Amino acid sequence: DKICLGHHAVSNGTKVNTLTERGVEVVNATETVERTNIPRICSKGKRTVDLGQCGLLGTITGPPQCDQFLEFSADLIIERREGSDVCYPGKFVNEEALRQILRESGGIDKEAMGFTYSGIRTNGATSSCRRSGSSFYAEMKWLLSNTDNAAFPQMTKSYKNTRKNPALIVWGIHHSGSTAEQTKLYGSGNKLVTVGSSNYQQSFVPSPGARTQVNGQSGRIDFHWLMLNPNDTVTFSFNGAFIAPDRASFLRGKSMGIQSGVQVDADCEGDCYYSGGTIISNLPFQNIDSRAVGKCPRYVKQRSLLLATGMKNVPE
């Protein structure tokens, strides 16, 4: 006698939001904001380098921590908190800029600049850089006066990059802990280290003076860098306090650097990384880490945003 038209319903629908109403119940909804972690670096498919004890900038100068990686090749570069760019205390000028370049470098291929030093000591070392007792950076040369207080003969060096990609040159200025040891290592009188090329144009003067005892030393080493163009030619004029380089660095290809505190995993595949692991999701948004890198869901403040996949629920 009668026929009816109807729609399904449930006893326990889920609440979602609309333009018009808050918490209106629907049949079925799905999550749109991701919160699910993976406490490892999903590295499957990518050639990964875990720097560990080694600081990223240290792969260019080569302290003992980084002997492992003096010429690394990577798709995925991982920095660790215990990493140090240094054995003998010192900073890098424009450190974070250089850090950002190396993260995408793909790795570094080194090449000898071929400097020859006459009339001076060349084999400077320190108890801070330990291999078999005292040593120094593996890529640098601690140019020293031939003996104590002996004058440092004003020298000039040169190096022309002949490759198709530009060359990362890195040198250092040694600041002594006193005027006493400064002359003891480079002779008396003022010192100057000027550096020239096409692009670059600057100069440097050491600053002897007492400091805190960082790693047993009072002195510091100011590491500076520049990018040398194809066909261009660096020029190092100096007469002391100069930490000469032996090798210039070249960028291999393309990579992506992250900073994490969780173990690697060559079994899971990943694309979005952060300090706490990998975010593998199909959802458009995430609420895990705003500083996530790679190809990631968009970071949003909300913990949850539910997209209805069913109709308005009207129970029986």
Binding site: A9, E96, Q259, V300
Partner: protein
């Protein structure tokens, strides 16, 4: 919803309708039955899936580090970076909030209209043989056995066959 079906004339939904999203419920001589309409159920499902495919979106845009977690960058450049990211997080938090609330509003209204459509379609089939009960049902003014009900459900019901009789029961 904007179409008065769900939470409207159909006073409620059927928890017994597990076959599909929409369906028929008839009462005749042989008793009472309840069967779902595949065509309309699939129509609504296909449109919800269509929302899903487009919203499960992957950007090929890669973003790298401009911050540093282990050695804090210079204060001024760090504050600009922190300010920029914060202003953009605010934008995507807004976009996400609006996107979902908008799609949810559309999803409800959509399923609401698919029901109404179906109700209108059955109404066009019976023509003069039935009348609206006001609760989403049609009172058939002839006798409708289970095969008659089926003919309505599977869209093969002929109204001329029962026209004379149904109109007679004025």
């Amino acid at each position: 919803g904007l179409f008065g079906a769900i939470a409207g004339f159909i006073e409620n939904g059927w928890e017994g309708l597990i076959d599909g999203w929409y369906g028929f419920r008839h009462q005749n001589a042989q008793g009472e039955g309840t069967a779902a309409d595949y065509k309309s159920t699939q129509s609504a499902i296909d449109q919800i899936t269509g929302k899903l495919n487009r919203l499960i979106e992957k950007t090929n845009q890669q973003f790298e580090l401009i911050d540093n977690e282990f050695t804090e960058v210079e204060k001024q450049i760090g504050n600009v970076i922190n300010w920029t990211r914060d202003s953009i997080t605010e934008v995507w938090s807004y976009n996400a909030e609006l996107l979902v609330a908008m799609e949810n509003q559309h999803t409800i209204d959509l399923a609401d209209s698919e029901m109404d459509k179906l109700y209108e379609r059955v109404k066009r089939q019976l023509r003069e043989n039935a009348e609206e009960d006001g609760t989403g049902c049609f009172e058939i003014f002839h006798k409708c056995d289970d095969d008659c009900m089926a003919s309505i459900r599977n869209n093969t019901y002929d109204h001329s066959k029962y026209r004379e009789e149904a109109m007679q029961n004025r």
